[PDB]
Structure formats: C-alpha cells, structure tokens
Design a protein around this ligand. Structure first.
Ligand SMILES: [Cu+2]
Ligand SMILES: [Cu+2]
Ligand SMILES: [Cu+2]
Ligand SMILES: [Cu+2]
Ligand SMILES: [Cu+2]
Ligand SMILES: [Cu+2]
Ligand SMILES: [Cu+2]
Ligand SMILES: [Cu+2]
Ligand SMILES: [Cu+2]
Ligand SMILES: [Cu+2]
Ligand SMILES: [Cu+2]
Ligand SMILES: [Cu+2]
Ligand SMILES: [Fe+3]
Ligand SMILES: [Fe+3]
Ligand SMILES: [Fe+3]
Ligand code: NA
Ligand code: NA
Ligand code: NA
Ligand code: NA
Ligand code: NA
Ligand code: NA
Lengths: 273, 273, 273
C-alpha cells in the first residue's frame, strides 16, 4: 500500500524478576507479542518503560533511522517511567537505478532490548525482553496460526526445563513457526514429522527452487527464521516432539510437543480418560 | 513409481562397547549402512534389537507415522531381543490444492537411535548408532561412489584421533559425500581442492542458481547435507585433506584424506616403493 | 578472458609478536591484503617467508594443484628465508559433457597459513596470517570500497577489545563486506541498519530469488561470505554498530562502527566541535 500504523508497547518487570514486553500494562509476555506488517507499512510504536532501569526496543531487519536503534550510544533508549516513539519502516522490493535489486523487508525478524544489564541488552534479553516480528510480502501464504519458539540460552521461551511449551493443531492446519535464538549458545532446532525449505518463507517456490529441505537447523544468538507446515501432512496425528538436537540440551530439557490431533480431538496413545 | 521395499536391520553391541546397526547380524558398521530410495518409495524395515538394553530407529526427513518415530513416549522403541517393523514413506513434490508447493522427500538424511542412555539417544548416538539415508528425485545425478562422513563429538565415524577415515578415488570419478554431525559440538567441515553448492544436491542447477559455492560449512548435532564432486577436477591428483576447521579439532585429530589417484594409481609424492 | 597475473607476497613477524602477510616487506597487515581476480584468471604468487619458522599460504575455493596446497604433508610450505611460487587458478561456470553444471570459482574466499604452530596453522592464524580473496564473475556489480571483517577467536582483525575497527562511508556509497571467521569459536555477525541476501553475492538476483534476507548470520572457523549494501539506504546517516551477537562476545568487545556520514560529512549526534 502501504499503511501507517500506530501501536503502544510497554516494558515491565514481572513479579519473579523476569521482564516482558506487552501491548497493555499487566499483560506482558515472554516472548513478547507478535508484530506483523506488510512491506510498505510504517509502524510508530509508542513505547513506555515502566521499569526502574533504562530499557529499549531494538529491531532486526526493518528500516529504522538511527534515532530508533534502541542504543545508549545513539540516545535511543528510555529512562525509567519514560515514553518514546520508535518508528519502524519497511519497503517493497524493486530495481534501483543502478540496475540491482533492492530486496524488500519481507522476512522473519525480531525485537529485543539493547540496554538492560549491559549496553548490548544481555540482562534484558536474558530476563525475557524479546519478541517476533513478521513482514509479509504481497501474495505470501498466510497461516491458521503462528507460534513463536525462542531458544534463550538453555531455555525455550524462558521456561523451566522439561515444561514445553507445547502447541496444538489438528491434522491439516497450516501452522507457522517463528524460530529465534538468543544468548550465549549455538543450538540445532529439530521437529519430528515435519520438514521445511531453508529459504525466506520456508516454502519452496516450485520445482526450480533448489533450496535444501530440512528438519534440523543450526542457529546462534539473534538468528531468526520461519516456516509453514501442514500439520500431520503425510504422517498423521501424534505427539510430535520438537527440540534442540544438541544432545545435552535435549537431555537437560530443551524439548516440547507439537500435539497434532485427529478430527476427534485425540492424540494416538494419549486419549483422555 | 513408487516401489514398496522390505529390509532387515539389526542393532548390536560390539566387543569394544560400541554399538552399530547392520543389515546382517555380525556385520554391524559405524556409521551404519546407507539406505537409498527414490521419492515415492515406501520402506518397511524389520528391525531387531539384539542388545540387552532398549533401542530404536529414528529417521530424519522421511514421512513416518507416530508409531515409527522411534521414541519411548510413543511406544515406538524395541525391547531387548525384540523385533518391530518401522515404516518410512516418501513423497514426490507437487502442487497442493491450496496452490502451494509440497517439497518432496528428496535429500540427504540420516537415522539414529533415540533411547539408549537417555530418551534422546545420547548413549546410542555416542556408541555408533547412526547412519545415512538418501532420497533421490527422478532425474538426480548418480555418483560412482558414496562416502559417509560423520562428525560425532570429537571423532570422525567414531575413529580414534588421526586415523582417518581415508577414501580413495581416481581423477575424474564422480564422488558423493553425505556429511552428518552428532553429539555436543559445532564443527566446520572443510575439503581441500574441491567445492560444492550449498543447496539440496550440492550441484548448481545452472547459471540462475544463486546458491553460495563453498568449501567450508558450519554444522551442528543432527545436521545433514550432501554433495557430489568430480575428483581432481581442475586441480589433479593428490592427498587432499578434509577436516574440521575448528583449529583445536583438526589439531586433536579430526582429519582424514581424500586420496585422488592418477590413472597410474599413484598419489603425487607418495608413490609405492 | 582470462588473464595470467603475477604478484609478490611476504610473511613477516611483527615487532609485537603477531605475524602478517603483505605485498611489500615492511607493509604487512592483519588482515592481509585483498587479492581480487576474475573467473578464468591465473595468479602466480611469488611468496617469500621472511620469518625464522616455516610458513605457508593455503587458499580456499580457488583451483590449486597439490603442490600449492600450503601443507607440510605435500611439501608445499616454505623454509625460513625461502621463496616459493604458488599458483592459484580459477574457472568460469559451464556445462560439463555429463550435462551437469560446473559452478565457477566466483565467490568470497580467503587465504591463511597452514604450518605455523601446528600443521593446521593454528599459531599462524592466531598471530594474523589470514586475508581475503574475491573472485568475480563477468557482470558482477563492483563496489565503491571493500572492507574485510575477520572474527579471529575473540577479536575482530586481531584488535584489542572495544577498539573497532571502524569503517566510514557516505549515504549512498556501495559498500562491500568480506566476512571471515577463524579459530576456536562460533559467532553471529550482525549489522545495524543494513541487510543482505544469504547467497553468493549477497544480492538477490530478482523477484524469483527465494534466498533469505538477513542481518545476522552464524559463522565458524574458516567460513567466508560477503555482500554489498547501499550505505544508509532507507535508514539515513548514523553510527551504525556491527558486532558479534553472542552476548558475552559483544560485551567483551567484539563491536565496531559503520560510520555512515551525511553529505556534510557528519554523523547525527556526533558532529565535530
Ligand atoms: Cu546490536
Ligand atoms: Cu541447544
Ligand atoms: Cu527426529
Ligand atoms: Cu539483535
Ligand atoms: Cu528427536
Ligand atoms: Cu570440529
Ligand atoms: Cu583448505
Ligand atoms: Cu535426530
Ligand atoms: Cu586445511
Ligand atoms: Cu562471537
Ligand atoms: Cu540489531
Ligand atoms: Cu582454511
Ligand atoms: Fe502453566
Ligand atoms: Fe583398520
Ligand atoms: Fe590506531
Ligand atoms: Na497486523
Ligand atoms: Na499427557
Ligand atoms: Na537402494
Ligand atoms: Na602414506
Ligand atoms: Na585485482
Ligand atoms: Na566519537
């Protein structure tokens, strides 16, 4: 189009010492809420830091001016109790005058804090100040649901070991995953029963797309990718594990379930009593 | 086509404490033997666990039902002395009704144990219960030979440091490599004298394939890729090293040789006496 | 064409104990100087080892015979004070008789020592014996400037923590980055304000190129990639950070600046007094 959109966000400290972003005070989540826009759109985010330490929003991929980089160095962070408007722009792909192709902002991206604990946001990220951003290209396939999976150090979504998260679908649902990594460690994301293309959308464009089809992918801090799968396609219903495949990581609890249900709402072998 | 194929496999403990898969009892190898099929084919594997601990077969990439996921959770592992038939299916690529492209099973994949030592197969994998699977697309180029190189923790194919393995070819042979990683560590696979495309087949489709041409690739646990090279192409005969390029890893013995011979059967500088 | 080119290079020890390559004695740098050629060209490098320990030149990607592999094993290293001519060839892409596509040498590559400290060049690499090589395809877009960024263990270009390097551009400059990793650690390279395509050239070929557009990329020892960006495109002037995104690495000093200036030569918020 594109559209000018406006949005409020808050950073807040949670009772247990974690920190989260939210669209409303008292409704902070880890990961933070999904921001989704179309190439061309501009997003003005009125950000309020409700915490007692400085905090910021820094985003990957999108077009922001230096005044919205979220760093102390560029005076782009937010004092305790303060408010700042960050502007994220996006563009559509197209040919420059030099004849090269400007790529477009479309992709799976993310936002996170850049000043809590250290000037690279090490404490903020660790505490939960991260969330996903999706930029869609005109004509991209849209899913029934999007789930965000973040490997943050040795946790998934800052959860305790062996507590998921778990996600549920029914055979045939189009499910989108946004997969983000943060912290200190490399990981390998693996899903049982499902595969995707290692390219922008996770979907091959057709028979001439030579991208590798995979079910396992090495990631490190601040990597983001995403894909769509048809739940149970060619494989049926089941409690399908996803996990980090680094062996000590899966053993120490970086595992969850993709619960793909039959049309009767049950998972083979785990029917309700 | 595709074809329904049947096959027997065994897991067995080896005299030195390692564990291996094989197509015949007493002929277990590490890595396990190569399974190769075409997109469309179904493979029914009659698996017998000859060991005194529970064991399983779990596969990447291929279409299996939950009853063949190889996990304790889905009652898909095999008691000591028991037998179970695992079914792996594959599909061809093509357009779904939703207009998106279903990708096909073609690729370089692998199988491994999922219950020895831990419920993620940490002990089994460590002991040698891993092997390669290749799914071919109609029209894929076939090689003269396929070699499997597995970086398993700080070993290549569970070998002692500085003992290879070494592989031999003659200048002009079409050689296929299946490269799998397991365990705890990230690695970088490097081959001297030879390069490949970072895509599904390791071969560029033509002048419009923008995939990076590389000779060095970061991998982590459960990653698999593969490629074909023409031995000695543009570079001639030689003892061409391959190794992990992580410096302490190569120094500690993650090195072997790709011995590419002249038509007289010799390697420059290392002629037999 | 291609062209036969000749060049002199030296390895030398620097007063502080580091080691560097150069085109002239007394002008060694870390990283070493950029070698750039076109597909088809042959480069004969007359290399002199001025140091008191054996040293070599080993290159990635390019077509070299075994006598130019730079290893002790193939008698391809250079005694103290000695001279050796290494030959690097390159080829253009095209169809083989077997109907497959030979890929071409084009890409972002690198050279480094293979015998100082260990027979994998661990000491040489650590001390600074590394540099970039670019092979261009006919018709590739050429930049205004090329900068080389090497993550060598926990340093950028062997620099002390928090000392850059910094690079400067003006809004609208076409800037090329060659990004190389060495040593023991995995890293994630991230640039604020700028993005590129994860493919050979870092530039999408057009609307049908499905390569992921990224601003963050995991790398390990001996990985090389490169890309071109338009400085400030869609984002304007600024002190744009680049850094490793592994959180302890950025905190410990793996950070520098891409200083993109307005047409008046200033950086927003950091104008000269
Ligand atoms: Cu940053
Ligand atoms: Cu992990
Ligand atoms: Cu699996
Ligand atoms: Cu970041
Ligand atoms: Cu698993
Ligand atoms: Cu390694
Ligand atoms: Cu090499
Ligand atoms: Cu696995
Ligand atoms: Cu080497
Ligand atoms: Cu790093
Ligand atoms: Cu950033
Ligand atoms: Cu190297
Ligand atoms: Fe709960
Ligand atoms: Fe032997
Ligand atoms: Fe200085
Ligand atoms: Na939206
Ligand atoms: Na349950
Ligand atoms: Na076969
Ligand atoms: Na020998
Ligand atoms: Na040149
Ligand atoms: Na300054």
């Amino acid at each position: 189009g594109g559209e000018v959109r406006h949005l409020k966000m808050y950073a807040e400290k949670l009772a247990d010492g974690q920190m989260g972003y939210g669209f409303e005070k008292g409704k902070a989540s880890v990961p933070g809420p999904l921001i989704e826009v179309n190439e061309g759109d501009t997003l003005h985010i009125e950000f309020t830091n409700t915490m007692d330490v400085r905090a910021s929003l820094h985003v990957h991929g999108l077009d922001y001016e230096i005044s919205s980089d979220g760093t102390a160095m560029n005076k782009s962070d937010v004092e305790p109790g303060g408010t700042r408007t960050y502007t994220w722009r996006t563009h559509k792909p197209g040919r420059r005058d030099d004849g090269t192709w400007r790529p477009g902002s479309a992709g799976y991206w993310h936002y996170h804090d850049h000043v809590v604990g250290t000037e690279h946001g090490t404490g903020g990220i660790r505490n939960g100040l991260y969330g996903p951003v999706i930029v869609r290209r005109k004509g991209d396939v849209l899913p029934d649901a999007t789930h965000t999976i973040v490997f943050n150090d040795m946790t998934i979504n800052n959860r305790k070991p062996h507590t998921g998260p778990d996600f549920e679908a029914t055979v045939g649902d189009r499910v989108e995953i946004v997969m983000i990594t943060h912290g200190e460690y490399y990981h390998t994301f693996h899903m049982h029963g499902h595969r995707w293309a290692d390219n922008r959308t996770g979907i091959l464009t057709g028979p001439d797309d030579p991208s590798r089809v995979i079910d396992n992918k090495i990631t490190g801090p601040a990597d983001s990718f995403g894909f769509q799968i048809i739940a149970g396609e060619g494989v049926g219903a089941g409690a399908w594990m996803y996990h980090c495949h680094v062996q000590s990581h899966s053993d120490m609890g970086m595992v969850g379930l993709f619960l793909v249900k039959k049309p009767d709402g049950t998972i083979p072998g785990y029917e309700p009593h």
